[PDB]
Write a protein that binds this DNA or RNA. Sequence first.
RNA 1: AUUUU
Length: 184
Amino acid sequence: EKMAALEAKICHQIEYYFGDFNLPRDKFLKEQIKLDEGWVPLEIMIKFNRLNRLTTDFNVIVEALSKSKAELMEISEDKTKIRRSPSKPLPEVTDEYKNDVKNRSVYIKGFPTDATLDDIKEWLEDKGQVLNIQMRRTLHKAFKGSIFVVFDSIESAKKFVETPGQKYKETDLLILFKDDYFAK
RNA sequence: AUUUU
């Protein structure tokens, strides 16, 4: 277990960077990918903060992916560069789709300003497949305590949004669809 | 060029 859990964290992080949600908004990455038919050096990858926190060891990152479930990433011949499989292009961002991403967006208020992505990640663990967590922030770049969660499907969004209890382990939360939130 | 580069 504990090792397998960690190798999965490694995978999911790399897969989030190159994911459908994050890549379109990742100028640094979008750039790197243009320099070599999409390949990016693990030497530059270990630079990413959240990945680095887990490991800076190239082989470890390679075993972790070699054994992925999403199978969205590609490892190079010399096992030093990785990339998003060309056979898995990014979506055609249409209005029908920009709209559907909104319907899958939920707002939650009541998170201790001193909570981290892993605190929020942990709590969401068994509440539905999520594609993105947005920690809202002030001007001083501080965590407002409120966030935006994007789920993989409306079904799990609606199930979530429509659950009574919804208390953050002791505290109580405000849970609305990103849409309503703008009744402000 | 770290708002999960």
